[PDB]
Design a protein around this ligand. Structure first.
Ligand code: CLA
Ligand code: CLA
Ligand code: CLA
Ligand code: CLA
Ligand code: CLA
Ligand code: CLA
Ligand code: CLA
Ligand code: CLA
Ligand code: CLA
Ligand SMILES: CC1=C(/C=C/C(C)=C/C=C/C(C)=C/C=C/C=C(C)/C=C/C=C(C)/C=C/C2=C(C)CCCC2(C)C)C(C)(C)CCC1
Ligand code: SF4
Lengths: 95, 81, 143, 33, 80, 69, 159, 733
């Protein structure tokens, strides 16, 4: 018995022995409103298949990244603005 | 005269090293009186330097273009010392 | 078939104010090596998880983390306090494997009733080179 | 477009190919049969 | 896990097992020495590989011998 | 035989065992276990210790060879 | 009140005021990480919303274009990207840790010793619902932070 | 095998995270994989070699493609001395506009990286005068990579699966590799140089559409079949030739005039053509040596069983050596890496002195980058040669099948070898450090005339034995009356003499006492790396401290604190500490190279000849001085093109210091730290929900050693690359 005087090896209740405890895992019911919960359920059930979620995430994120970096001009990143400066002649002429 | 090295008894840059070290030690010698211990020690080091350079000259050491004695190890009878 | 296991009951545990070197999630999914000992008096001993514990007069019980913890504790017990000890292995399913003497006698007294394994009847230089056991599961030392 | 191809391929490679590769390799690590 | 082996040069001094902190070893009777005992290694699953056994084997090179091998959670000595 | 089987107590002996520290080194036999069932009876005492700070070890009869001196 | 966890001294933790107290345990027990009873989707929605705002914070004002006119928009875009990546790593986590249909690996016990129901978050479908909620909530929180930075710029600090 | 390592069920049955690292690190140790055979071993090796060839052709295709697409090669062809090469463009979105402005070189409309690889010079010397040429080459190399990939795929299938008796065919393989892979290969390279590269140097472009029509020589193959080969050396580009135009050109294709081209300060293309041709004859003749299916030739087995000297000095000779090499892949690999490292160092030592590419001698960063590259590569390849010999002595060496032979008699006097190599390294380090320190002091006492300056009389004798009159020995080539000078008096020696005596080029540099001392430092490094490696290889099977080391394998952490302590006892750890000493040695080599050459290029050889004889000269006049333009790559006020090299310099410093973490600190402090971390993560709320799948552990000792060496060597290499490239590019002399 786990509740005896300084007994912590209830061999039947191995969860209390090994420390298997929801230390803060309240089993209290849903505190949210039902209507907004149903709203989020119906509007996020597309993101229920973890594999399809991963494929969508990777492919759409790569697409959006390529789109941003291809449609962005040099005003938002200097690498695409270009030199906008004459090139300096290197040492020893240019070599 | 081997290995393109002139002897130190007939080298220009070796004498230049001598003159430069002597002027360096004399620049540190015009700050004390010529009879006190620092000036006497500086003059002793000066004579030490001059005799050092003259001894490296008279032994037939070979001084290169940099003006420093380059020792010959090949086994030349002149350079067994 | 000469020494039966002891099947540790719900014994009391030592008086201890609690530490952080105790049982982590390894116990919750794997074994955690209970130890049992029997004290003549209520004395104080160093715990292998750090800190000082007060063992109780009579049988005690400690579920610490692993085999080396309980065996180090038991060696300190047997040497410093001159006390018989025995420890176990408690899988999460429920089974309790008895392990320390496995014969009622500590593993120094060569008491008959134990079969010799890990026993190569040769000097240590007469093992074959690896090329002689190349492309075989036996590495160098199982022939 | 040739000046715009690095802008497509460098964000593609150096961010997505780590996403794909490290994700798939973490899944290959954490696998069981 | 680790592969502990005891070779026939053992004198049966019981230091290998009195040093072993994980009950891997145990002395058994034998007829090859004056002490009439030799060490065995049944509980190699509990072997961490600390080589306290072979740091206490007083022979020419060794009689007990620990071979590092497949490391599990108990050979790696993990409380987690 | 009940008489001695191995070298004499004190006979300086050489080690033919390839894995020992004192391989191709001389020794000094301090005892020979006359029991005709032990595998390494020849208790040798060397002059210089091994890496484990030990100067003595048991050797076999075929893993040992007495010198001409 | 530093007595051990559940009064169990050989478990590696303690019921100090920081862990086990009426205020901090209550706070850690009534937030969407530990609502083991409600479905994981609403939990993930709450979590993602909060972290979407928390990420849009240090992207508009702290970033490569913070001083420009593209500070808020591009910073929110980077925050949405980090959110997509966080849902990505959450997704591979749910795939790698538990496969398809096993029971919950969460503890079925509490401090009071009640054999409570296991947290279905730790299951495959449960963690997937949690990840979906996290992604939805995070993109929504990113765009709502962008909206609040747009229409309500004056009360917040610019510096 | 259930988890990620499909090739070792001992690591799959490891709940920790060591399995990931060891499945990375043993992925390519096939002869340690579980439940495999020799057939599968050799076949996996063959497919792996196909993959390596695919990667090599792909990487060359990437170089060609990026030089064609993002480069300025068509501009480099016109004015190569004054137009900067371009490796590839850069699209780094973290860049600021000053960095976009600074990295715009070579006449580009965007940022770029300067090709310090010399690929421009070597492509321009072999034809390839347009971007379309490089595009065709890159596409063809992509085809070759796909070819290697499909070949390695099908040679894994059961229908096309060579048996071990085919891999072990060490005579047919040798004949074919010699004859074809060297002789025919260099012959085809000559057939390029004669048909393309020389005509591309002589003017006209000879391409696939018109290479059947263009005669490489005005009398096509009459001189060759009629034996009148001298008609191919008639007009050998008589000293007024501009590389890439017919002015001062000729008609010869094969010459032995020797020396350098005056414009390029490089070797003549006709000399390279005749060279590859001659060595093609030699290799095609040598590849008809070993016995094959046609009844004639040699059996290497009997060649080895016949080379047993009467007298018993070597004992059983090379008996049983064919079987212990052909069966042992590690022996083949060790000999191969030996030869490869020596010839790689030869590539370095002969490309710095005898550059075979147009306008690579006059550009100064590629000539240093290539030398440094190939010498560090050679040092690594040599350490690997010895490490694989050690792995052979453990895994594949059968002492009974080669009893008392050259190999067994070798392992006998391992103590003699180790002791005399120890003597050589100890002597060299003692003496040469003492001399460097004596000179450091004599400068520190203002008396540079007291320094130990030993003129390298022997290297100067060899130099004067080749035509250098800077010493006045007048022996065998500087003496006009010597028969060696009289023999080649009319063949090569005019060009070779006006090359070696010309004090602008870089073959047979005028050496002095600093060269002597740093050559002895180099000898210390070679002898010491050799000592470490040879000692590990010969004590790989065992020693007195651990005689059964063959049973623990090549790579194992230790044998415990017993027997005094056994840290770093494995032959792997000998390799380890030898990689340290190798990096040190190659650092000495390349420091010597870079300082001698940067002083030659700047003009002040006196700087090296005066300052290289005392270590504070290297610390001041080489490291502190040439790092002036580097660390100022990005100051608090602006940056320049050398910002990347300063960042890489500091990055390499950083990892070179991080390696000291894994080397100095060892496993136990980190395991305990990770135990505390695991406690905290399993008792930290909102992260208790997240539990690892692989139990975290500190890195294994051998692993963390490897990781420390990886960081250490990466930092060594990146730091010195940054410094060398930035110093030689900040000025270009
Ligand atoms: C191993 C050889 C190699 C290497 C190291 C590089 C290296 C590089 N390439 Mg190149 N490339 C190569 C082969 C190579 N390339 C080949 C064979 C092709 C033809 C299929 C290309 C086509 C190519 C394009 C079109 C672009 C690059 C770009 C780049 C850069 C970023 C990486 C990237 O997105 O590449 C993508 C490359 C591939 C998917 C081909 C892999 C085969 C980098 C400098 C980008 C760049 O210019 O950045 C400056 C870019 O836009 N590469
Ligand atoms: C925050 C620092 C930072 C970061 C992130 C970058 C990022 C980049 N720089 Mg760099 N750069 C920086 C600072 C930085 N820069 C600074 C301060 C300077 C000096 C001013 C430069 C100067 C500079 C130059 C000159 C160039 C770059 C280039 C690049 C791009 C390389 C393309 C790529 O995807 O590489 C991919 C990654 C690699 C090739 C690394 C290979 C080694 C990895 C670690 C091992 C891989 C492990 C394994 C084999 C594969 C498994 C999968 C793996 C994903 C896990 C990339 C966008 C290049 C560029 O624009 O070309 C496109 C280029 O030429 N940068
Ligand atoms: C940038 C870091 C960051 C920030 C600002 C937040 C912020 C937040 N998280 Mg998130 N979280 C993070 C990282 C972060 N998280 C990571 C890395 C994980 C993976 C373990 C999570 C997993 C997670 C879950 C599962 C949940 C949250 C929740 C929350 C919210 C309240 C609980 C909280 O954080 O206090 C609690 C703080 C602690 C437990 C840490 C205590 C440690 C010491 C005592 C504090 C030291 C702070 C001091 C300044 C240093 C809050 C919006 C909850 C939420 O979203 O509700 C809407 C929720 O349920 N977080
Ligand atoms: C680098 C730190 C950093 C920075 C620069 C910002 C910056 C910003 N935050 Mg964020 N924030 C941060 C950390 C940060 N935050 C953290 C650690 C928390 C607690 C988890 C928050 C919680 C927070 C809230 C709750 C809100 C902001 C908001 C804002 C904005 C206006 C604040 C007035 C501004 C863009 C406000 C906003 O609407 O953003 C537009 C807002 O409502 N922040
Ligand atoms: C003539 C017929 C022939 C030819 C041409 C080859 C060709 C080859 N074989 Mg061999 N092979 C043959 C017959 C032949 N094989 C037969 C009959 C067998 C029967 C057993 C084998 C069995 C065999 C095995 C088992 C393996 C090979 C392998 C290889 C490849 C070696 C790797 C490589 O490319 O480096 C080639 C290297 C060189 C050409 C030159 C290297 C050294 C020179 C001297 C250095 C100096 C010059 C330098 C190159 C200049 C560079 C300057 C600049 C251009 C960069 C190569 C494609 C390996 C492979 O990759 O598998 C596909 C392999 O594992 N072969
Ligand atoms: C494998 C190398 C190789 C290959 C495939 C060819 C192939 C060819 N050569 Mg070339 N050639 C080569 C090496 C090679 N040659 C070498 C090494 C030399 C110098 C000895 C020459 C010198 C040479 C001349 C001088 C001529 C050819 C010609 C030819 C063509 C007709 C020959 C019958 C043919 C395209 C002929 C042609 O018109 O083209 C021609 O006149 N060759
Ligand atoms: C032709 C070249 C060649 C070939 C075919 C091999 C092949 C092999 N080597 Mg050898 N090796 C080489 C060059 C080569 N190496 C060189 C140049 C060195 C010197 C650095 C070494 C040093 C070396 C050591 C010290 C060891 C091997 C080992 C091995 C085996 C396993 C390698 C593995 O899976 O690690 C995969 C490695 C990694 C994933 C990461 C390595 C880290 C660097 C930083 C990545 C670059 C395999 C038979 C091991 C062996 O045989 O075990 C007994 C071993 O212990 N090699
Ligand atoms: C009696 C003294 C003595 C003698 C005769 C030798 C003889 C030898 N040693 Mg050993 N050695 C000695 C002492 C001695 N050693 C000591 C004390 C050390 C510790 C520093 C070493 C460390 C050492 C190494 C590491 C190596 C040798 C090597 C060698 C051989 C080559 C000689 C050489 O390079 O000198 C080596 C000399 C030194 C490294 C300097 C130390 C020598 C000291 C100064 C002499 C000590 C004299 C003693 C204290 C005076 C007592 C006088 C008595 C009347 C009371 C040779 C067989 C090498 C070898 O085996 O290659 C064949 C080799 O690798 N020796
Ligand atoms: C500057 C650093 C440094 C130095 C000086 C050495 C020195 C040496 N190493 Mg290396 N080593 C180093 C770094 C260094 N190592 C690093 C970082 C590693 C990686 C772990 C290694 C790995 C390594 C291995 C694996 C091996 C060596 C070996 C050697 C020895 C080679 C023989 C030789 O040249 O000795 C000549 C003597 C010296 C260089 C010592 C210089 C000091 C002077 C001469 C002493 C006298 C001064 C003064 C009077 C003494 C009093 C001082 C004070 C108490 C008052 C020598 C002791 C090899 C060896 O032992 O061969 C014999 C060998 O096998 N070392
Ligand atoms: C460990 C081991 C291994 C490895 C090893 C190694 C890696 C080695 C190396 C080695 C090396 C790396 C070597 C080298 C050598 C060299 C030499 C030996 C040289 C010679 C030379 C000569 C003889 C010359 C001559 C001449 C001249 C002088 C010039 C001119 C010309 C003539 C020709 C006349 C093996 C696998 C094997 C086995 C096992 C063990
Ligand atoms: S320590 Fe060695 S010799 Fe002693 S009992 Fe154990 S195995 Fe035998």
């Amino acid at each position: 018995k786990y509740g005896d005087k300084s007994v912590y090896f209830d061999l039947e209740d191995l969860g209390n022995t090994t420390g298997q405890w929801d230390v803060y895992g309240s089993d209290a019911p849903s505190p949210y409103n039902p209507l907004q919960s149903k709203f989020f359920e119906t509007f996020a059930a597309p993101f229920t298949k973890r594999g399809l979620l991963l494929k969508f995430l990777i492919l759409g994120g790569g697409s959006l990244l390529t789109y941003v970096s291809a449609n962005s001009t040099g005003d938002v990143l200097p690498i695409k603005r270009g030199p906008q400066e004459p090139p300096k002649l290197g040492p020893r002429g240019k070599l | 005269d081997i290995s393109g090295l002139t002897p130190c008894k007939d080298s220009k840059q070796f004498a230049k090293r001598e003159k430069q070290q002597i002027k360096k030690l004399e620049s540190s010698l015009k700050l004390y009186a010529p009879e006190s211990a620092p000036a006497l020690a500086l003059n002793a080091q000066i004579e030490k330097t001059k005799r050092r350079f003259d001894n490296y000259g008279k032994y037939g050491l070979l001084c290169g273009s940099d003006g420093l004695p380059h020792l010959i190890v090949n086994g030349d009878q002149r350079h067994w010392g | 078939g000469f020494t039966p296991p002891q099947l540790d009951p719900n014994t009391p545990s030592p008086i201890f104010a609690g530490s952080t070197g105790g049982l982590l999630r390894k116990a919750q999914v794997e074994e955690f090596y209970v130890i049992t000992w029997n004290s003549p008096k209520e004395q104080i001993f160093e715990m292998p998880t750090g800190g000082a514990a007060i063992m109780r007069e009579g049988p005690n019980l400690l579920k610490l983390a692993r085999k080396e913890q309980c065996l180090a504790l038991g060696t300190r017990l047997r040497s410093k306090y001159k006390i018989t000890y025995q420890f176990y292995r408690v899988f999460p399913n429920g089974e309790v494997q008895y392990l320390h003497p496995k014969d009622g006698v500590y593993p120094e007294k060569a008491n008959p009733g134990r079969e010799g394994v890990g026993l190569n009847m040769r000097s240590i230089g007469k093992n074959v080179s690896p090329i002689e056991v190349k492309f075989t599961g036996k590495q160098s030392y199982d022939l | 477009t040739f000046n715009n191809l690095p802008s497509i391929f460098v964000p593609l490679v150096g961010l997505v190919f780590p996403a794909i590769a490290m994700a798939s390799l973490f899944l290959h690590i954490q696998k069981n049969k | 896990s680790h592969s502990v082996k005891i070779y026939d040069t053992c004198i049966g001094c019981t230091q290998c097992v009195r040093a072993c902190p994980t009950d891997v070893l145990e002395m058994i009777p034998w007829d090859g020495c004056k002490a009439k005992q030799i060490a065995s290694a049944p509980r190699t699953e509990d072997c961490v590989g600390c080589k306290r056994c072979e740091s206490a084997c007083p022979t020419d090179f060794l009689s007990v011998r620990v071979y590092l091998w497949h490391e599990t959670t108990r050979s790696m000595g993990l409380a987690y | 035989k009940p008489p001695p089987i191995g070298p004499k107590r004190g006979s300086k002996v050489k080690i033919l065992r390839r894995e020992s520290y004192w391989f191709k080194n001389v020794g000094s036999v301090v005892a020979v276990d006359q029991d005709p069932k032990t595998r390494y009876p020849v208790v040798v005492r060397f002059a210089k210790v091994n890496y484990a700070n030990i100067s003595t070890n048991n050797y076999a009869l075929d893993e040992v060879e007495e010198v001409a001196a | 009140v530093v007595q051990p966890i559940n009064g169990d001294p050989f478990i590696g933790s303690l019921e100090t005021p920081v862990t086990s107290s009426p205020l901090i345990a209550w706070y850690l027990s009534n937030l969407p990480g530990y609502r083991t009873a409600v479905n994981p989707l609403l939990r993930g929605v709450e979590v993602g919303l909060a972290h979407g705002f928390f990420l849009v914070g240090p992207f508009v004002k702290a970033g490569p274009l913070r001083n420009t006119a593209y500070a808020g928009s591009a910073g929110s875009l980077a925050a949405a990207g980090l959110v997509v990546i966080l849902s990505m790593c959450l997704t591979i986590y749910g795939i790698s840790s538990f496969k398809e249909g096993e029971p919950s690996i969460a503890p079925s016990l509490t401090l009071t010793g009640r054999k409570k129901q296991p947290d279905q978050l730790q299951t495959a479908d449960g963690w997937a619902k949690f990840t979906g909620g996290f992604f939805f909530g995070g993109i929504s929180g990113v765009t709502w932070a962008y909206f609040l930075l747009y229409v309500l710029d004056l009360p917040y600090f610019v510096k | 095998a259930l988890r990620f390592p499909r090739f070792s069920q001992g690591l799959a049955q490891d709940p920790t995270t060591r399995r990931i690292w060891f499945g990375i690190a043993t992925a390519h140790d096939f002869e340690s994989h579980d439940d495999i055979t020799e057939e599968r071993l050799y076949q996996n090796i063959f497919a792996s070699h196909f993959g390596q060839l695919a990667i090599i052709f792909l990487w060359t295709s990437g170089n060609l493609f990026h030089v064609a697409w993002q480069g300025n090669f068509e501009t480099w062809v016109q004015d190569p001395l004054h137009v900067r090469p371009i490796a590839h463009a850069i699209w780094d979105p973290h860049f600021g506009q000053p960095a976009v402005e600074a990295f715009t070189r070579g006449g580009a409309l965007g940022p770029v990286n300067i090709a310090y690889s010399g690929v421009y010079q070597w492509w321009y010397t072999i034809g390839l005068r347009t971007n379309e040429d490089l595009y065709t080459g890159a596409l063809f190399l992509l085809f070759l990579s796909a070819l290697s990939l499909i070949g390695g795929w099908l040679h894994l299938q059961p229908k096309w699966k060579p048996r071990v008796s085919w891999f072990k065919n060490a005579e047919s393989r040798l004949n074919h590799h010699l004859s074809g892979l060297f002789g025919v290969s260099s012959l085809a390279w000559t057939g390029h140089l004669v048909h393309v590269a020389i005509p591309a140097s002589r003017g006209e472009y000879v391409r696939w559409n018109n290479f059947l029509n263009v005669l490489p020589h005005p009398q096509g193959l009459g001189p060759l079949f009629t034996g009148q080969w001298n008609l191919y050396a008639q007009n050998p580009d008589s000293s007024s030739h501009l590389f890439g135009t017919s002015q001062g050109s000729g008609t010869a294709i094969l010459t032995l005039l020797g020396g350098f081209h005056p414009q390029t300060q490089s070797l003549w293309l006709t000399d390279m053509a005749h060279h590859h041709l001659a060595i093609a004859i030699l290799f095609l003749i040598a590849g008809h040596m070993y016995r094959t299916n046609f009844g004639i030739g040699h059996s290497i087995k009997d060649l080895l069983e016949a080379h047993i000297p009467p007298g018993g000095r070597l004992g059983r000779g090379h008996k049983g050596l064919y079987d212990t090499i052909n069966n042992s892949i590690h022996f083949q690999l060790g000999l191969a890496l030996a030869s490869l490292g020596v010839i790689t160092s030869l590539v370095a030592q002969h490309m710095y002195s005898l550059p075979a590419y147009a306008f690579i001698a006059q550009d100064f960063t590629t000539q240093a980058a290539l030398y440094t590259h190939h010498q560090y590569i050679a040092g690594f390849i040599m350490t690997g040669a010895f490490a694989h010999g050690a792995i052979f002595f453990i895994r594949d060496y059968n002492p009974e099948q080669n009893e008392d032979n050259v190999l067994a008699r070798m392992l006998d006097h391992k103590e003699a070898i180790i002791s005399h190599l120890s003597w050589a390294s100890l002597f060299l380090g003692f003496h040469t450090l003492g001399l460097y320190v004596h000179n450091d002091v004599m400068l520190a006492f203002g008396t540079p005339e007291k320094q130990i300056l030993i003129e390298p009389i022997f290297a100067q004798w060899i130099q004067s034995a080749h035509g250098k009159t800077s010493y006045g020995f007048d022996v065998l080539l500087s003496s006009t009356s010597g028969p060696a000078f009289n023999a080649g008096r009319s063949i090569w020696l005019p060009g070779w003499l006006n090359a070696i005596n010309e004090n602008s080029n870089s073959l047979f540099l005028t050496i002095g006492p600093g060269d002597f001392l740093v050559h002895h430092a180099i000898a210390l490094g070679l002898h010491t790396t050799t000592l470490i490696l040879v000692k590990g290889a010969l004590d790989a099977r065992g020693s007195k401290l651990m005689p059964d080391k063959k049973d623990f394998g090549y790579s194992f952490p230790c044998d415990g604190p017993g027997r005094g302590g056994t840290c770093d006892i494995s032959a792997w750890d000998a390799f380890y500490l030898a990689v340290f000493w190798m990096l040190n040695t190659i650092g000495w080599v390349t420091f010597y190279w870079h300082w001698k050459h940067i002083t030659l290029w700047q003009g002040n050889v006196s700087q090296f000849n005066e300052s290289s004889t005392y270590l504070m000269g290297w610390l001041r006049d080489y490291l502190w001085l040439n790092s002036s333009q580097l660390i100022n790559g990005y100051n608090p006020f602006g940056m320049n093109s050398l910002s990347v090299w300063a960042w890489m310099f500091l990055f390499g410093h950083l990892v070179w210091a991080t390696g000291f973490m894994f080397l100095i600190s060892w496993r136990g402090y980190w395991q305990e730290l990770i135990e505390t971390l695991a406690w905290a993560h399993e008792r930290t709320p909102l992260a208790n929900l997240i539990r690892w799948k692989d139990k975290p552990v500190a890195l294994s000792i051998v692993q963390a050693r490897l990781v420390g060496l990886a960081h250490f060597s990466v930092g060594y290499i990146f730091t010195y690359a940054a410094f060398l490239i930035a110093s030689t590019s900040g000025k270009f002399g």
